[PDB]
Protein backbone atom coordinates (compact mmCIF):
# COMPACT_ATOMS: atom_id res chain seq x y z
CA UNK A 1 0.00 0.00 0.00
CA UNK A 2 0.81 3.65 -0.82
CA UNK A 3 0.30 6.59 1.54
CA UNK A 4 2.03 9.50 -0.14
CA UNK A 5 2.28 13.05 1.24
CA UNK A 6 1.38 15.83 -1.20
CA UNK A 7 1.17 18.99 0.91
CA UNK A 8 2.12 20.33 4.31
CA UNK A 9 0.23 23.39 5.30
CA UNK A 10 0.15 25.54 8.34
CA UNK A 11 -1.40 28.82 9.03
CA UNK A 12 -2.87 28.56 12.42
CA UNK A 13 -0.91 29.18 15.51
CA UNK A 14 -0.98 26.34 17.92
CA UNK A 15 -2.80 23.09 17.51
CA UNK A 16 -5.25 22.30 14.72
CA UNK A 17 -8.30 20.31 15.80
CA UNK A 18 -10.35 19.86 12.64
CA UNK A 19 -10.25 19.77 8.86
CA UNK A 20 -13.36 19.52 6.68
CA UNK A 21 -13.81 19.23 2.90
CA UNK A 22 -16.25 21.40 1.04
CA UNK A 23 -18.66 19.04 -0.81
CA UNK A 24 -17.21 20.04 -4.20
CA UNK A 25 -13.80 18.61 -3.17
CA UNK A 26 -11.75 21.70 -4.15
CA UNK A 27 -11.94 23.69 -0.89
CA UNK A 28 -11.49 22.75 2.78
CA UNK A 29 -11.73 24.45 6.17
CA UNK A 30 -9.56 24.08 9.23
CA UNK A 31 -10.06 25.18 12.83
CA UNK A 32 -8.10 25.15 16.00
CA UNK A 33 -6.72 26.61 19.16
CA UNK A 34 -6.32 30.08 17.66
CA UNK A 35 -10.12 30.65 17.40
CA UNK A 36 -10.04 31.24 13.62
CA UNK A 37 -11.37 29.21 10.70
CA UNK A 38 -9.25 29.10 7.56
CA UNK A 39 -10.84 28.42 4.17
CA UNK A 40 -8.30 27.00 1.69
CA UNK A 41 -8.86 27.23 -2.05
CA UNK A 42 -6.69 25.38 -4.55
CA UNK A 43 -5.30 27.06 -7.67
CA UNK A 44 -2.84 25.12 -9.76
CA UNK A 45 -1.00 22.78 -7.47
CA UNK A 46 -0.95 25.23 -4.55
CA UNK A 47 -3.27 25.21 -1.55
CA UNK A 48 -3.46 28.60 0.13
CA UNK A 49 -5.69 30.27 2.71
CA UNK A 50 -8.17 32.47 0.84
CA UNK A 51 -10.29 33.57 3.80
CA UNK A 52 -9.78 33.67 7.58
CA UNK A 53 -12.89 33.65 9.78
CA UNK A 54 -11.82 35.37 13.00
CA UNK A 55 -13.84 36.62 15.96
CA UNK A 56 -16.62 34.04 15.66
CA UNK A 57 -15.72 32.19 18.84
CA UNK A 58 -14.18 33.26 22.17
CA UNK A 59 -12.45 29.88 22.76
CA UNK A 60 -10.93 26.93 20.85
CA UNK A 61 -12.87 25.92 17.75
CA UNK A 62 -13.19 22.16 17.96
CA UNK A 63 -14.96 21.03 14.77
CA UNK A 64 -16.35 22.46 11.51
CA UNK A 65 -18.61 20.84 8.89
CA UNK A 66 -19.88 22.25 5.58
CA UNK A 67 -23.58 21.83 4.87
CA UNK A 68 -24.29 19.41 1.98
CA UNK A 69 -25.09 22.32 -0.38
CA UNK A 70 -21.75 24.01 0.31
CA UNK A 71 -23.30 27.36 1.25
CA UNK A 72 -23.14 26.91 5.04
CA UNK A 73 -20.26 26.23 7.40
CA UNK A 74 -20.98 25.30 11.02
CA UNK A 75 -18.27 25.63 13.68
CA UNK A 76 -18.44 24.08 17.17
CA UNK A 77 -16.51 25.78 19.94
CA UNK A 78 -15.45 25.33 23.55
CA UNK A 79 -17.25 28.65 24.14
CA UNK A 80 -20.62 26.77 24.20
CA UNK A 81 -21.89 28.03 20.83
CA UNK A 82 -22.17 26.77 17.28
CA UNK A 83 -21.66 29.44 14.62
CA UNK A 84 -23.31 29.13 11.21
CA UNK A 85 -21.26 30.90 8.54
CA UNK A 86 -22.96 31.82 5.27
CA UNK A 87 -22.02 34.10 2.35
CA UNK A 88 -25.10 36.27 2.69
CA UNK A 89 -24.07 39.61 1.18
CA UNK A 90 -21.42 38.45 0.87
CA UNK A 91 -18.16 37.14 1.82
CA UNK A 92 -18.35 34.66 4.72
CA UNK A 93 -20.09 36.11 7.78
CA UNK A 94 -21.57 34.63 10.95
CA UNK A 95 -25.33 34.88 10.43
CA UNK A 96 -26.60 32.62 13.24
CA UNK A 97 -25.42 31.28 16.56
CA UNK A 98 -26.94 28.19 18.14
CA UNK A 99 -26.58 28.41 21.92
CA UNK A 100 -28.15 26.28 24.60
CA UNK A 101 -25.37 23.96 25.69
CA UNK A 102 -23.99 24.71 29.13
CA UNK A 103 -20.48 23.56 28.24
CA UNK A 104 -18.04 23.19 25.36
CA UNK A 105 -19.60 22.19 22.04
CA UNK A 106 -17.56 19.27 20.68
CA UNK A 107 -19.16 18.30 17.38
CA UNK A 108 -21.53 19.42 14.65
CA UNK A 109 -23.02 17.49 11.74
CA UNK A 110 -25.57 18.03 8.93
CA UNK A 111 -28.25 15.65 7.65
CA UNK A 112 -28.14 14.43 4.05
CA UNK A 113 -30.80 16.93 2.92
CA UNK A 114 -29.37 19.85 4.89
CA UNK A 115 -32.63 20.22 6.83
CA UNK A 116 -31.24 19.02 10.14
CA UNK A 117 -28.17 19.99 12.11
CA UNK A 118 -26.91 18.21 15.20
CA UNK A 119 -24.54 19.29 17.94
CA UNK A 120 -23.27 17.62 21.10
CA UNK A 121 -21.54 18.94 24.18
CA UNK A 122 -19.60 18.19 27.33
CA UNK A 123 -22.96 18.77 29.05
CA UNK A 124 -23.77 15.14 28.13
CA UNK A 125 -26.59 16.20 25.72
CA UNK A 126 -27.16 16.06 21.96
CA UNK A 127 -29.18 18.76 20.18
CA UNK A 128 -31.02 18.59 16.85
CA UNK A 129 -31.88 21.77 14.99
CA UNK A 130 -34.30 22.19 12.11
CA UNK A 131 -33.16 24.47 9.29
CA UNK A 132 -35.98 26.51 7.81
CA UNK A 133 -35.19 29.96 6.47
CA UNK A 134 -32.05 31.69 5.30
CA UNK A 135 -30.26 32.02 8.65
CA UNK A 136 -32.82 30.86 11.24
CA UNK A 137 -32.74 27.61 13.21
CA UNK A 138 -35.32 26.25 15.63
CA UNK A 139 -34.53 23.45 18.04
CA UNK A 140 -36.26 20.10 17.52
CA UNK A 141 -34.80 17.79 20.20
CA UNK A 142 -32.62 17.85 23.28
CA UNK A 143 -31.45 14.28 23.82
CA UNK A 144 -30.00 13.34 27.19
CA UNK A 145 -29.30 9.57 27.15
CA UNK A 146 -25.53 9.91 27.47
CA UNK A 147 -24.01 9.92 30.96
CA UNK A 148 -20.81 11.75 30.09
CA UNK A 149 -19.17 14.14 27.70
CA UNK A 150 -20.33 13.53 24.13
CA UNK A 151 -17.58 13.74 21.62
CA UNK A 152 -18.95 13.38 18.18
CA UNK A 153 -22.21 13.32 16.22
CA UNK A 154 -22.53 12.19 12.61
CA UNK A 155 -25.54 11.62 10.36
CA UNK A 156 -26.42 8.56 8.33
CA UNK A 157 -25.39 9.11 4.69
CA UNK A 158 -28.94 8.57 3.37
CA UNK A 159 -31.57 8.55 6.12
CA UNK A 160 -32.37 10.93 8.98
CA UNK A 161 -30.57 8.74 11.51
CA UNK A 162 -28.00 10.32 13.85
CA UNK A 163 -25.04 8.67 15.62
CA UNK A 164 -23.24 9.99 18.71
CA UNK A 165 -20.05 8.84 20.45
CA UNK A 166 -19.38 9.41 24.13
CA UNK A 167 -16.83 9.52 26.91
CA UNK A 168 -19.29 7.18 28.63
CA UNK A 169 -17.88 4.50 26.22
CA UNK A 170 -21.10 4.00 24.22
CA UNK A 171 -22.48 4.97 20.84
CA UNK A 172 -26.14 5.89 20.40
CA UNK A 173 -28.47 6.03 17.40
CA UNK A 174 -31.48 8.34 17.01
CA UNK A 175 -34.53 8.56 14.72
CA UNK A 176 -38.03 10.09 14.72
CA UNK A 177 -40.91 8.07 15.84
CA UNK A 178 -43.93 8.02 13.49
CA UNK A 179 -46.83 9.13 15.68
CA UNK A 180 -45.38 11.72 17.89
CA UNK A 181 -42.61 12.92 15.80
CA UNK A 182 -40.21 13.02 18.57
CA UNK A 183 -36.65 12.04 18.32
CA UNK A 184 -35.75 9.06 20.41
CA UNK A 185 -32.71 6.85 20.90
CA UNK A 186 -33.20 3.50 19.16
CA UNK A 187 -29.89 1.71 19.87
CA UNK A 188 -26.88 1.67 22.20
CA UNK A 189 -23.61 0.14 20.97
CA UNK A 190 -21.55 -1.00 23.92
CA UNK A 191 -18.33 -3.03 23.08
CA UNK A 192 -15.83 -0.18 23.66
CA UNK A 193 -13.98 -0.07 26.97
CA UNK A 194 -13.21 3.65 26.96
CA UNK A 195 -14.04 6.97 25.31
CA UNK A 196 -15.40 6.70 21.77
CA UNK A 197 -13.73 9.59 19.90
CA UNK A 198 -14.78 8.85 16.31
CA UNK A 199 -17.60 7.29 14.31
CA UNK A 200 -18.34 7.22 10.60
CA UNK A 201 -20.81 5.30 8.40
CA UNK A 202 -19.90 3.21 5.37
CA UNK A 203 -21.08 4.22 1.88
CA UNK A 204 -24.66 3.02 2.31
CA UNK A 205 -25.15 3.46 6.07
CA UNK A 206 -25.41 -0.28 6.77
CA UNK A 207 -22.14 -0.31 8.75
CA UNK A 208 -20.42 1.99 11.20
CA UNK A 209 -16.77 2.22 12.24
CA UNK A 210 -15.75 3.57 15.64
CA UNK A 211 -12.42 4.40 17.27
CA UNK A 212 -11.59 4.76 20.90
CA UNK A 213 -9.33 5.76 23.70
CA UNK A 214 -9.25 1.99 24.33
CA UNK A 215 -6.91 1.78 21.22
CA UNK A 216 -9.32 -0.30 19.10
CA UNK A 217 -11.44 0.40 16.10
CA UNK A 218 -14.69 -1.51 15.74
CA UNK A 219 -17.01 -2.31 12.84
CA UNK A 220 -20.71 -2.34 13.68
CA UNK A 221 -23.35 -3.93 11.44
CA UNK A 222 -27.03 -3.08 11.26
CA UNK A 223 -29.27 -6.13 11.39
CA UNK A 224 -32.87 -5.68 10.17
CA UNK A 225 -36.05 -7.67 11.02
CA UNK A 226 -36.11 -10.08 8.10
CA UNK A 227 -32.71 -11.20 9.19
CA UNK A 228 -30.96 -14.00 7.25
CA UNK A 229 -27.92 -14.17 9.58
CA UNK A 230 -30.02 -15.33 12.56
CA UNK A 231 -29.78 -12.05 14.54
CA UNK A 232 -32.60 -11.39 17.00
CA UNK A 233 -34.45 -8.25 15.95
CA UNK A 234 -36.54 -7.18 18.99
CA UNK A 235 -39.35 -4.65 18.39
CA UNK A 236 -38.22 -4.73 14.70
CA UNK A 237 -35.69 -2.05 15.51
CA UNK A 238 -32.51 -2.41 13.59
CA UNK A 239 -29.98 -3.62 16.10
CA UNK A 240 -26.29 -2.87 15.78
CA UNK A 241 -23.82 -5.60 16.69
CA UNK A 242 -20.03 -5.31 16.82
CA UNK A 243 -18.83 -7.69 14.11
CA UNK A 244 -15.12 -6.80 14.20
CA UNK A 245 -12.62 -5.43 16.69
CA UNK A 246 -9.26 -4.43 15.19
CA UNK A 247 -6.97 -4.71 18.22
CA UNK A 248 -3.29 -4.03 18.78
CA UNK A 249 -2.82 -1.73 15.78
CA UNK A 250 -2.77 1.45 17.84
CA UNK A 251 -0.53 2.27 20.80
CA UNK A 252 -2.43 5.32 22.08
CA UNK A 253 -5.95 6.76 21.89
CA UNK A 254 -7.43 6.91 18.37
CA UNK A 255 -8.92 10.38 18.00
CA UNK A 256 -10.71 10.15 14.64
CA UNK A 257 -11.79 7.70 11.94
CA UNK A 258 -13.08 8.37 8.42
CA UNK A 259 -14.73 5.80 6.10
CA UNK A 260 -14.26 6.72 2.45
CA UNK A 261 -17.62 6.60 0.70
CA UNK A 262 -16.00 6.34 -2.75
CA UNK A 263 -13.51 3.54 -2.06
CA UNK A 264 -14.59 2.03 1.26
CA UNK A 265 -11.11 2.69 2.64
CA UNK A 266 -10.94 3.50 6.37
CA UNK A 267 -8.52 6.04 7.88
CA UNK A 268 -7.55 6.52 11.52
CA UNK A 269 -5.75 9.27 13.42
CA UNK A 270 -3.87 8.32 16.56
CA UNK A 271 -2.31 9.88 19.64
CA UNK A 272 0.89 8.07 18.63
CA UNK A 273 1.24 10.50 15.67
CA UNK A 274 0.42 7.89 13.00
CA UNK A 275 -2.12 7.66 10.17
CA UNK A 276 -3.26 4.12 9.28
CA UNK A 277 -5.28 2.91 6.27
CA UNK A 278 -7.44 -0.24 6.43
CA UNK A 279 -9.41 -2.21 3.84
CA UNK A 280 -11.82 -5.12 4.01
CA UNK A 281 -10.14 -8.19 2.51
CA UNK A 282 -11.54 -9.77 -0.65
CA UNK A 283 -12.70 -12.91 1.21
CA UNK A 284 -14.43 -11.14 4.10
CA UNK A 285 -17.16 -12.87 6.08
CA UNK A 286 -20.05 -10.35 6.27
CA UNK A 287 -20.87 -11.23 9.92
CA UNK A 288 -17.21 -11.43 11.00
CA UNK A 289 -15.34 -9.20 8.55
CA UNK A 290 -11.59 -9.01 8.34
CA UNK A 291 -10.17 -5.52 7.97
CA UNK A 292 -6.44 -5.38 7.46
CA UNK A 293 -3.90 -2.59 7.37
CA UNK A 294 -2.90 -2.00 3.75
CA UNK A 295 -0.60 0.99 4.41
CA UNK A 296 0.48 3.09 7.39
CA UNK A 297 2.44 6.22 8.19
CA UNK A 298 3.67 6.04 11.76
CA UNK A 299 5.47 9.38 11.39
CA UNK A 300 2.62 11.22 9.68
CA UNK A 301 2.83 14.11 12.13
CA UNK A 302 5.30 15.04 14.84
CA UNK A 303 2.43 15.07 17.37
CA UNK A 304 -1.05 13.63 17.96
CA UNK A 305 -3.13 13.34 14.80
CA UNK A 306 -6.50 14.84 15.67
CA UNK A 307 -8.56 14.43 12.49
CA UNK A 308 -8.66 12.64 9.16
CA UNK A 309 -11.21 12.99 6.36
CA UNK A 310 -11.42 11.46 2.88
CA UNK A 311 -12.11 13.83 0.02
CA UNK A 312 -15.78 13.37 -0.96
CA UNK A 313 -14.90 13.73 -4.67
CA UNK A 314 -11.20 12.95 -5.18
CA UNK A 315 -11.06 9.26 -4.28
CA UNK A 316 -7.94 8.43 -2.31
CA UNK A 317 -7.16 12.03 -1.30
CA UNK A 318 -6.92 12.24 2.50
CA UNK A 319 -6.53 15.29 4.73
CA UNK A 320 -5.22 15.27 8.30
CA UNK A 321 -4.29 17.76 10.96
CA UNK A 322 -2.26 17.55 14.11
CA UNK A 323 -1.37 19.06 17.46
CA UNK A 324 1.93 19.82 15.67
CA UNK A 325 0.38 22.83 13.87
CA UNK A 326 0.26 21.30 10.37
CA UNK A 327 -2.38 20.10 7.94
CA UNK A 328 -1.28 17.36 5.54
CA UNK A 329 -2.96 16.34 2.27
CA UNK A 330 -2.17 12.77 1.27
CA UNK A 331 -2.99 10.56 -1.67
CA UNK A 332 -3.59 6.84 -1.09
CA UNK A 333 -3.13 4.24 -3.82
CA UNK A 334 -3.57 0.53 -3.17
Amino acid sequence: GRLILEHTLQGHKGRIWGVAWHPKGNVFASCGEDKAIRIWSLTGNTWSTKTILSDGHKRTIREIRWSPCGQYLASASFDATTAIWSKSSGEFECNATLEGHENEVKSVSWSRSGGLLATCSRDKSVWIWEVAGDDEFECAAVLNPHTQDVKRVVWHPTKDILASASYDNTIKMFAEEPIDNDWDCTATLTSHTSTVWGIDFDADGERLVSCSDDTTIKIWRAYHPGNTAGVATPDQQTVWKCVCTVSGQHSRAIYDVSWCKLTGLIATACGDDGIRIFKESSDSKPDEPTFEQITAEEGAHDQDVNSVQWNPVVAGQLISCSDDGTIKIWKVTE
Partner: protein, 132 residues
Amino acid sequence: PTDIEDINPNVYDDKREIFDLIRNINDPEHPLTLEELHVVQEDLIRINDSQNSVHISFTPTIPHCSMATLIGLSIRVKLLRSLPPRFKVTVEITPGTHASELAVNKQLADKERVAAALENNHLAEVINQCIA
Protein backbone atom coordinates in the same frame (compact mmCIF):
# COMPACT_ATOMS: atom_id res chain seq x y z
CA PRO B 1 -14.90 13.84 41.21
CA THR B 2 -16.50 16.72 39.33
CA ASP B 3 -15.72 17.71 35.74
CA ILE B 4 -12.02 18.57 35.28
CA GLU B 5 -13.12 21.62 33.24
CA ASP B 6 -14.82 23.29 36.21
CA ILE B 7 -13.53 24.89 39.42
CA ASN B 8 -15.39 25.56 42.62
CA PRO B 9 -15.37 29.35 43.34
CA ASN B 10 -14.23 28.66 46.94
CA VAL B 11 -10.77 27.40 45.92
CA TYR B 12 -10.47 30.42 43.66
CA ASP B 13 -11.23 32.86 46.49
CA ASP B 14 15.72 11.91 33.94
CA LYS B 15 13.74 10.94 37.06
CA ARG B 16 15.32 13.49 39.42
CA GLU B 17 14.84 16.55 37.19
CA ILE B 18 11.17 15.63 36.77
CA PHE B 19 10.80 15.50 40.57
CA ASP B 20 12.53 18.90 40.81
CA LEU B 21 10.00 20.44 38.41
CA ILE B 22 7.05 19.04 40.40
CA ARG B 23 8.14 18.75 44.06
CA ASN B 24 7.51 22.41 44.99
CA ILE B 25 4.13 22.90 43.31
CA ASN B 26 1.96 24.29 46.11
CA ASP B 27 -1.15 22.41 47.10
CA PRO B 28 -4.30 24.35 46.11
CA GLU B 29 -5.72 24.37 49.70
CA HIS B 30 -3.07 23.82 52.40
CA PRO B 31 0.08 26.04 52.63
CA LEU B 32 2.54 23.24 51.73
CA THR B 33 4.26 21.80 48.69
CA LEU B 34 3.11 18.55 47.17
CA GLU B 35 6.40 17.06 48.28
CA GLU B 36 5.77 18.24 51.84
CA LEU B 37 2.41 16.43 51.76
CA HIS B 38 4.00 13.28 50.21
CA VAL B 39 1.65 13.72 47.22
CA VAL B 40 4.56 13.67 44.77
CA GLN B 41 7.53 11.39 45.41
CA GLU B 42 10.61 10.87 43.26
CA ASP B 43 10.03 7.11 43.41
CA LEU B 44 6.58 7.47 41.81
CA ILE B 45 8.08 8.98 38.64
CA ARG B 46 8.77 6.56 35.79
CA ILE B 47 10.64 8.16 32.88
CA ASN B 48 11.34 6.31 29.60
CA ASP B 49 13.37 8.49 27.20
CA SER B 50 13.65 5.34 25.04
CA GLN B 51 10.00 5.98 24.19
CA ASN B 52 9.33 9.72 24.93
CA SER B 53 7.16 8.72 27.90
CA VAL B 54 6.83 10.25 31.38
CA HIS B 55 4.47 8.58 33.85
CA ILE B 56 3.82 10.28 37.18
CA SER B 57 1.89 8.76 40.08
CA PHE B 58 0.48 11.11 42.73
CA THR B 59 -1.09 10.20 46.10
CA PRO B 60 -3.95 12.38 47.44
CA THR B 61 -3.69 12.89 51.21
CA ILE B 62 -7.18 11.45 51.78
CA PRO B 63 -8.93 8.87 49.56
CA HIS B 64 -11.91 11.21 49.17
CA CYS B 65 -9.75 14.25 48.35
CA SER B 66 -11.94 16.64 46.37
CA MET B 67 -8.82 18.31 44.87
CA ALA B 68 -7.32 15.30 43.12
CA THR B 69 -8.18 16.35 39.57
CA LEU B 70 -6.78 19.84 40.21
CA ILE B 71 -3.54 18.50 41.66
CA GLY B 72 -3.08 16.28 38.61
CA LEU B 73 -3.86 19.13 36.24
CA SER B 74 -1.25 21.35 37.87
CA ILE B 75 1.33 18.56 37.54
CA ARG B 76 0.36 18.17 33.86
CA VAL B 77 0.67 21.88 33.11
CA LYS B 78 3.97 22.31 34.90
CA LEU B 79 5.36 19.52 32.70
CA LEU B 80 3.52 20.71 29.59
CA ARG B 81 5.37 24.03 30.04
CA SER B 82 8.82 22.53 30.72
CA LEU B 83 9.35 19.51 28.55
CA PRO B 84 10.04 19.32 24.79
CA PRO B 85 6.74 18.73 22.96
CA ARG B 86 8.00 15.26 21.94
CA PHE B 87 7.04 13.90 25.38
CA LYS B 88 3.79 12.15 26.22
CA VAL B 89 3.03 12.79 29.89
CA THR B 90 0.75 10.53 31.93
CA VAL B 91 -0.39 11.61 35.38
CA GLU B 92 -2.26 9.02 37.42
CA ILE B 93 -3.45 8.56 40.97
CA THR B 94 -1.28 6.09 42.88
CA PRO B 95 -3.15 2.75 42.68
CA GLY B 96 -5.55 2.24 45.58
CA THR B 97 -5.08 5.74 47.08
CA HIS B 98 -8.36 7.36 46.00
CA ALA B 99 -11.95 6.10 45.99
CA SER B 100 -12.52 7.36 42.43
CA GLU B 101 -9.00 6.77 41.11
CA LEU B 102 -10.17 5.48 37.70
CA ALA B 103 -12.48 8.44 37.05
CA VAL B 104 -9.80 10.96 38.03
CA ASN B 105 -7.29 9.04 35.91
CA LYS B 106 -9.59 9.08 32.85
CA GLN B 107 -10.14 12.88 32.98
CA LEU B 108 -6.45 13.74 33.27
CA ALA B 109 -5.70 11.52 30.26
CA ASP B 110 -8.37 13.12 28.07
CA LYS B 111 -6.37 15.75 26.16
CA GLU B 112 -9.51 17.54 24.99
CA ARG B 113 -10.97 17.93 28.46
CA VAL B 114 -7.60 19.02 29.81
CA ALA B 115 -7.43 21.60 27.01
CA ALA B 116 -10.94 22.89 27.75
CA ALA B 117 -10.03 23.12 31.44
CA LEU B 118 -7.09 25.39 30.68
CA GLU B 119 -9.45 27.80 28.84
CA ASN B 120 -11.43 28.20 32.04
CA ASN B 121 -10.01 31.53 33.18
CA HIS B 122 -10.58 30.89 36.89
CA LEU B 123 -9.14 27.36 36.75
CA ALA B 124 -6.07 28.55 34.82
CA GLU B 125 -5.01 31.10 37.45
CA VAL B 126 -5.51 28.70 40.34
CA ILE B 127 -3.11 26.46 38.42
CA ASN B 128 -0.64 29.27 37.63
CA GLN B 129 -0.54 30.36 41.27
CA CYS B 130 0.19 26.75 42.26
CA ILE B 131 3.05 26.14 39.80
CA ALA B 132 5.00 29.39 40.29
